[PDB]
Structure formats: structure tokens, C-alpha cells
Design a protein around this ligand. Structure first.
Ligand SMILES: CC(C)(C)COc1ccc2c(c1)[C@]1(COC(N)=N1)c1cc(-c3cncnc3)ccc1O2
Length: 364
């Protein structure tokens, strides 16, 4: 899988993207990798932010599905025309598949001014696809039409340019150290998982664990921050405040509404315990402040409250090598060979632990 190593690029806080080709002859586009949506959607018109876009008129393999699609999400929207065409990933497996493609013809707050990507690859499941679950997502199409195994994995390496690896169809053992630990995918829509316990510098928050997954917890490469449900964020902040009370900071800062500036150890490690593979067994992943204090001297608090549930975004994923094992309905975590650490503290994946009543932590 060596040709796939380092196939991801990006700029700080504008996501990670992979090179793809669409149409015949192939048209090259940079596409955002998003495990929190399920559509393959590409710029199709000369929006001024775009370096390039899908020109359906140049493709002999393009086919129109004669149907529109409308996608508002919390922070913007896109709209487009559905079709299919031949798709491939140059620094991915050596295969060409016919996939659904949303030709984006109108958007708001979707494309980023200054960014070097022109589309979005939704790697989540059919259920949250638009307009409905019959629009087969890319990865489903990929697996159905080839012998590429039903899994992919992500090493998001962070820092300004970021880099990483999307290993399609397998696992590359050089990208991680120690053992992979697997949490079950509770349901195949988003990559939903269950958090059963939360610790700040070893101190259990002691909240009903139902709170950690109200109304869900997901693993999402298209979100920068670790996002925590309101009640839990509050409780978590209060403990980061207490733990880090060596210095003081404004209330805006904790809300991610102002920065703080200097010219690490005052801040606690954060630990999430995830449901394991066996009854009454968990494991924990541990991240550093290096992961949740983001460079904007100046820094942003990369943890924020949420109304949609826990989102394990880039802040979490940059610590680890993450295996989206769709074949076995599970997600694996291991310490990333590329993650950024002190020579004191370190990102960690440790287990097994004993946790009772893990099923009660899920929300219905
Ligand atoms: C329909 C649905 C399932 C409710 C969600 O559909 C969606 C539809 C469109 C869409 C998303 C979700 C997002 C928003 O969050 C994620 N994961 N992708 C997203 C994130 C980014 C982005 C990532 N990283 C840094 N900066 C920006 C850019 C565009 C973008 O567009």
C-alpha cells in the first residue's frame, strides 16, 4: 500500500483532500475527505474560489440521472444535478468505477476562499445520503464493482500545510505503533460509536455516560474540533479550568470566541473510553493539549459544545491511525506513527479495561 502513503493534503482548518479523476478523458480534482457525510459532490461551474471544476461536456462516459439534489447542513448548503461517470483515485488502488456524482451548481458557505479543493467525498453510509438511501455512496460503489476489501483507514498528520494518508482497501502497519483497538459501529449511517467514560488528567467526570452520546457520538474527518454535548462540554471545561488554574482566561476563549496568546503542562490530557469488542470490556484513547490547543504565540481552544452529539473530529483523529472496518462494523484506533508529542506525555491507546453497563450509554 506504499503508493497510498502521503496521498492527503490540506491547509490548517480547511480539511484534508485527496486527488481524484472523473470522466473520460480523466479530469483531475482535489476532493475533501469526509467521514461525516455520504455524497460524492463536485464543483461543476466557475465559482471564483475554484482552481478547477467538473466539465460534464468533456466526458463521453457521463450519464445524466435527470434529478436534482438539495443539501443544507448546519454551516452552509450545496445544490446540484445528479449523474454518474467513471471515477478513479490516482494515488489509490489501480481501479476505475462508475459512481454517482452530484454536479454542484449552487452553494453557500461550502467552498472555502483560499482552499485547494473542489468537492467532497462522503465516506459514510447510504442512510444519510441525499436525496435518499437509494443513491449508492462512492465507497459502496467501489466495493461492489471491484475486489477492493470493504475498509479504509486514515492517518491525519496535521501540521500551514497538513498531510496524511488514506489507505483504501487495507491497513498499512508503518503508519502506527502498538496494537489497534476496535470499537463497534453502533449503526451504519454516520460512523457512530459509543463513549462509555471520560477522564481529564485521570479524573472521571462522573456523569451518566448517556450524556456523552446524547444524541450520538461519531467519528468525523470533516470536522476540525472535538465537539462535546452541551452538558458534557460544560462539565469538561469546568475540570480543564480547575486543572489548569495556574493561569486565568476569558469566558469567550472557552467558547471559541476569542484567542489567548503567549510568546503545555498547565493543560491536562483528555481520555475517552470507548465500548470494546467484548461484553464489559472497554479501551481508552488519550490526547494531548498539542491536539486540542490549535495554532491560529496565539492559540484556539479546539473543543466546543454541540447540539448534534459528540464529534470526534481532527483534534481526536490527528493523534491516531483510524481504521474504518466496514466489513466487520467496527472502528480501530492505534497510536499514530506521525502524531505530535512532548518527550514527557504522549498520545495513547490502552486496554483492556472493565466497564459495566456500556449498552446503557447509547441514546435511543
Ligand atoms: C447532509 C449531512 C449528512 C447532514 C451533512 O452533509 C454535509 C454536507 C456538506 C458538507 C458537510 C456535511 C461538512 C460539514 O461537516 C462534515 N463532516 N462535512 C463539510 C465540512 C467542510 C469542512 C471540513 N473541514 C474543515 N472545513 C470545512 C467543508 C464542507 C462541508 O460540507
Amino acid at each position: 500500500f506504499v503508493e497510498m502513503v502521503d496521498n492527503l493534503r490540506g491547509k490548517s482548518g480547511q480539511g484534508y483532500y485527496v486527488e481524484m479523476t472523473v470522466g473520460s478523458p480523466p479530469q483531475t480534482l482535489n476532493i475533501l475527505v469526509d467521514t461525516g457525510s455520504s455524497n460524492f459532490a463536485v464543483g461543476a461551474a466557475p465559482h471564483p474560489f475554484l482552481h478547477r471544476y467538473y466539465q460534464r461536456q468533456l466526458s463521453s462516459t457521463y450519464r445524466d440521472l435527470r434529478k436534482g439534489v438539495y443539501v443544507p447542513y448546519t454551516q452552509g448548503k450545496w445544490e446540484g444535478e445528479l449523474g454518474t461517470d467513471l471515477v478513479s483515485i490516482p494515488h489509490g488502488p489501480n481501479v476505475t468505477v462508475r459512481a454517482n456524482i452530484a454536479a454542484i451548481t449552487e452553494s453557500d458557505k461550502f467552498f472555502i476562499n483560499g482552499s485547494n479543493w473542489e468537492g467532497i467525498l462522503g465516506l459514510a453510509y447510504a442512510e444519510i445520503a441525499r436525496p435518499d438511501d437509494s443513491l449508492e455512496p462512492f465507497f459502496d460503489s467501489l466495493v461492489k464493482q471491484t475486489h477492493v476489501p470493504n475498509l479504509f483507514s486514515l492517518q491525519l498528520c496535521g501540521a500551514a500545510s497538513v498531510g496524511g494518508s488514506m489507505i483504501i482497501g487495507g491497513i498499512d502497519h508503518s503508519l502506527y505503533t502498538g496494537s489497534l483497538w476496535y470499537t463497534p459501529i453502533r449503526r451504519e449511517w454516520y460512523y457512530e460509536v459509543i463513549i462509555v467514560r471520560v477522564e481529564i488528567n485521570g479524573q472521571d467526570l462522573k456523569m451518566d455516560c448517556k450524556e456523552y452520546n446524547y444524541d450520538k457520538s461519531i467519528v468525523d474527518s470533516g470536522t476540525t474540533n472535538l465537539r462535546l454535548p452541551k452538558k458534557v462540554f460544560e462539565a469538561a471545561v469546568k475540570s480543564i479550568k480547575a486543572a489548569s488554574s495556574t493561569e486565568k482566561f476569558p469566558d469567550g476563549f472557552w467558547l471559541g470566541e476569542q484567542l489567548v496568546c503567549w510568546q503545555w503542562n498547565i493543560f491536562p490530557v483528555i481520555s475517552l473510553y470507548l465500548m470494546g469488542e467484548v461484553t464489559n470490556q472497554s479501551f481508552r484513547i488519550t490526547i494531548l493539549p498539542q491536539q486540542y490547543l490549535r495554532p491560529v504565540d496565539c492559540y484556539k481552544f479546539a473543543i466546543s459544545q454541540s447540539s448534534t452529539g459528540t464529534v470526534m473530529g481532527a483534534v481526536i483523529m490527528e493523534g491516531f491511525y483510524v481504521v474504518f472496518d466496514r466489513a466487520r462494523k467496527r472502528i480501530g484506533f492505534a497510536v499514530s506513527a506521525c502524531h505530535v508529542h512532548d518527550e514527557f506525555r504522549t498520545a495513547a491507546v490502552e486496554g483492556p479495561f472493565v466497564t459495566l453497563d456500556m449498552e446503557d450509554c447509547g441514546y435511543n
